[PDB]
Design a protein around this ligand. Structure first.
Ligand SMILES: CCCCCCCCCCCCCCCCCC(=O)OC[C@H](COP(=O)([O-])OC[C@H](O)COP(=O)([O-])OC[C@H](COC(=O)CCCCCCCCCCCCCCCCC)OC(=O)CCCCCCCCCCCCCCCCC)OC(=O)CCCCCCCCCCCCCCCCC
Lengths: 70, 171
């Protein structure tokens, strides 16, 4: 009856779940298991470029804590 | 014109604060509390000299006082701070609001073991007064002598000599 639209709606819902889940897993994979750094403002970008400079491996996401200093 | 005068490469060598931005943002309020005085001496020197080359030594004091800020965290409260900057480091916009329990643990461990009060909402944006012994720069714009202005008008205004003197008009 009416519930035969539910396979098509379910397949459409899976096909809409794929982009958001995909970009979340890609942001966690390309950034060391964390969110993607949002730089809307130039201060956030300056901190991100500082992280890229202080990581030593030319990657902003590799974080260095108190173990880097003595 | 003249040779620009830059400091040498050995003049700029200092032990940098080699930590990430989330490590800095996690320790930011206690850094603004405890490392107040050389930071404000430096930023006062920086807005008064208007020249970074005349601000290096005070800047080194900043890089002297930040590291002693972190070692005193590293000697006492390394692990709650490590968990706290890790939780700050997870987020994209690096929200303080997503990490309040690690913040409470870090503030409790710091207030117990070191006796630092975290600054409240409104304190770190204050304009503070700084006691320095360096002289006030008498010409921070490297300006020169302003030209002499034109002489003003003075004296009582007498009538026009013989009127308008326009070809034949006697008034
Ligand atoms: C107790 C307290 C109270 C006491 C009160 C006592 C007084 C009571 C009366 C007060 C009221 C004022 C009365 C007049 C005062 C004397 C003015 C005078 O004669 O100046 C001589 C003036 C200069 O002569 P001056 O020998 O060197 O000095 C004698 C005075 O001491 C000149 O003295 P100044 O050095 O002080 O004069 C200053 C300067 C002296 O002048 C100059 O520096 C020389 C240059 C003046 C202008 C030249 C312009 C040239 C190109 C344009 C020409 C336009 C066309 C000509 C006219 C066509 C007709 C419309 O004049 C001006 O800058 C003003 C311009 C001229 C206007 C004169 C006054 C006219 C009033 C009545 C208007 C009627 C129409 C007049 C004609 C219209 C055109 C003006 O003569 C001329 O410029 C030639 C034109 C004649 C003047 C106007 C005549 C006035 C009487 C008209 C009666 C008939 C009207 C008929 C109907 C209308 C016409 C169709």
């Amino acid at each position: 009856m009416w519930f035969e639209v539910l396979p098509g709606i379910a397949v459409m819902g899976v096909c809409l779940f794929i982009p958001g889940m995909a970009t979340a897993r890609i942001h966690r994979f390309s950034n060391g298991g964390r969110e993607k750094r949002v730089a809307h403002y130039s201060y956030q970008w300056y901190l991100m470029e500082r992280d890229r400079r202080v990581s030593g491996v030319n990657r902003y996401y590799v974080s260095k804590g108190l173990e880097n200093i003595d | 014109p003249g040779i620009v005068e830059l400091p040498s490469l050995e003049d700029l060598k200092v032990q940098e604060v080699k930590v990430s931005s989330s490590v800095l943002k996690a320790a930011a309020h206690h850094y603004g509390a405890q490392c107040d005085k050389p930071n404000k001496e430096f930023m006062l020197c920086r807005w008064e000299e208007k020249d970074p080359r005349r601000c290096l030594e005070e800047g080194k004091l900043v890089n002297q006082c930040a590291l002693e800020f972190f070692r005193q965290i590293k000697r006492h409260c390394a692990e709650p701070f490590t968990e706290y900057w890790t939780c700050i480091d997870y987020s994209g916009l690096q929200l303080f609001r997503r990490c309040r329990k690690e913040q409470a643990q870090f503030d409790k461990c710091v207030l117990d073991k070191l006796g630092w009060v975290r600054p409240d909402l409104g304190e770190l944006s204050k304009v503070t007064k700084v006691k320095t012994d360096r002289p006030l720069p008498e010409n921070p714009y490297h300006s020169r002598a302003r030209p002499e202005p034109n002489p003003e008008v003075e004296g009582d205004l007498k009538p026009a000599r013989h009127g308008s003197r326009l070809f034949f008009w006697t008034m």
